[PDB]
Design a binder for this molecule. Structure first.
Ligand code: L7H
Length: 469
């Protein structure tokens, strides 16, 4: 007798029937949700007929783009507190008479509807604290509410779920063990002597160590980005937003490093010195490549491709062809929508730092022109399919967040790279305009004579090379 009698929607909001006004499924693609109201999404999230692990994962990764953590907690609590449908007139008559009605439909509602749903709400809670504990770290009150809620749950079966959720919450509160599979190589130094932080610069630190420390820094920044940080947040990447601290830190780093390489190049007006700077940056790229740090490789490429750097024909004329080949092949990684890059990424062995920029590009492509909502019969439905497509892209990022580099952190170098601010107080566009004008100054366009500039560095320009000592 499949369909059951449910409480009315005036006492239980999840009891409203499915219609085109509140839920749409995909066809020619378990029914896959294309769109729906938040109420309908939450109902299907904790659906009585079957388990939906894929929808639970996707919803919990993407829900902040259409619903607040606090609102979500209210809705699942609401979903949990199921009223019983009022007795039928026939059942109520048996009660008048002092009799006990069979209550077949009531027993069945408890069994096939109340228990599967309450259980699925608890599974959602468990998945929530395990994979998205950061929601609770950012909002202490959210965690108070969750703890208070699970503490009111009664029943033996259910109490195993409450125990699991409690266990997780404790493990997450307690929680950085670092495991070297092999013995890390000796830290490399060049002109700047260890601890002499005031002299730290592009040419004074060892090319090898710059590349190792930037790889460690970028590996940590990449590993700290949660999938959910990339959902409904792509056009405000640079803004300090509560759902995206690690996304912001990663992008800031990439921007600062790329603009720093550029600055180091165009602010070195002496040709011989500028050639040494460019050559050193290609050396850092070589070491990035041997470290499988594709994020670093592509940061060097973006810098070498920027309008201020790309036009420096006299600088690049003095670069060894072996170095030019390296940079030329590094550019080819990005051609045909990163075709060669994806081939290398998928063929190399870990520790690696995947190029992060590509995920932002693809998420932007997926979200561009993709409606936030669908409108049916004047009502609004959340476009869940848009959220699902972003989640498929973010799922890829996770697979390369599990191997530590066998490399020793150098605290002073690390701090130097963490504190890079090439822009000063300038905005990016204006700074790049300034860099472009500096490019014109150091290498005037054809009619104009090539001026010769004073040296700004008094230390050897010769590189120690990319081979360990
Ligand atoms: C059709 O566009 C492009 C084709 C390119 N093809 C290749 C083989 N490499 C490129 N760049 C590498 C990173 C490079 C840069 C510099 N500065 C010097 C070298 C070299 F080693 F050769 F000297 C190599 C290219 C950049 C392109 O376009 C960019 C610049 C304008 O806007 C977008």
């Amino acid at each position: 007798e499949e369909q059951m009698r449910l409480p009315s929607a005036d006492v239980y909001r999840f009891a409203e029937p499915d219609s085109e006004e509140n839920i749409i499924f995909e066809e020619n693609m378990i029914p896959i949700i294309k769109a729906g109201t938040v109420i309908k999404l939450i109902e299907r999230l904790t659906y009585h007929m079957y388990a939906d692990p894929n929808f639970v994962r996707t919803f919990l990764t993407t829900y902040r783009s259409f619903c607040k953590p606090q609102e979500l907690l209210s809705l699942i609590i609401e979903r949990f507190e199921i009223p019983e449908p009022e007795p039928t007139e026939a059942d109520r008559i048996a009660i008048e008479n002092g009799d006990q009605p069979l209550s077949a439909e009531l027993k069945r509602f408890r069994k096939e509807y109340i228990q599967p749903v309450q259980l699925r709400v608890l599974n959602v809670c468990r998945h929530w604290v395990e994979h998205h504990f950061y929601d609770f770290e950012r909002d202490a009150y959210l965690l108070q509410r969750m703890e208070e809620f699970i503490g009111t749950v009664r029943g033996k079966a259910m109490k195993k779920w409450v125990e699991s959720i409690t266990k997780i919450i404790q493990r997450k509160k307690i929680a950085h063990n670092i495991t070297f599979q092999s013995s890390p190589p000796t830290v490399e130094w060049h002109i700047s002597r260890p601890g002499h932080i005031e002299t730290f610069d592009l040419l004074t630190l060892h090319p090898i160590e710059i590349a190792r420390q930037l790889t460690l820094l970028e590996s940590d920044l990449y590993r700290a980005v949660q999938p959910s940080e990339l959902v409904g947040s792509v056009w405000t990447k640079e803004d300090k937003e509560i759902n995206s601290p690690n996304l912001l830190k990663m992008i800031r780093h990439t921007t600062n490093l790329t603009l720093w390489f550029e600055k180091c190049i165009v602010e070195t007006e002496n040709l011989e010195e500028r050639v040494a700077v460019v050559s050193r940056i290609i050396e850092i790229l070589q070491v990035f490549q041997e470290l499988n740090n594709f994020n670093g490789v592509l940061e060097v490429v973006s810098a070498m491709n920027s309008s201020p750097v790309y036009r420096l024909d006299h600088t690049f004329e003095q670069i060894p062809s072996r170095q030019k080949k390296i940079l030329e092949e590094a550019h080819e990684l990005s051609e045909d929508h990163y075709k060669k890059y994806l081939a290398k990424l998928r063929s190399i062995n870990p520790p690696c730092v995947p190029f992060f920029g590509i995920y932002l590009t693809n998420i932007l492509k997926t979200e561009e022109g993709n409606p936030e909502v669908l409108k049916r019969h004047g009502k609004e439905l959340i476009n869940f399919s848009k959220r699902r497509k972003v989640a498929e892209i973010t799922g890829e990022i996770q697979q390369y967040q599990n191997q530590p580099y066998c490399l020793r952190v150098e605290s002073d170098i690390k701090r130097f790279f963490e504190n890079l601010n090439p822009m000063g107080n300038s905005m990016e566009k204006e700074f790049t305009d300034y860099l472009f004008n500096k490019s014109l100054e150091i290498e005037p366009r054809n009619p104009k004579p090539l001026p010769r500039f004073p040296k700004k560095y008094s230390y050897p320009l010769k590189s120690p090379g990319v081979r360990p000592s």
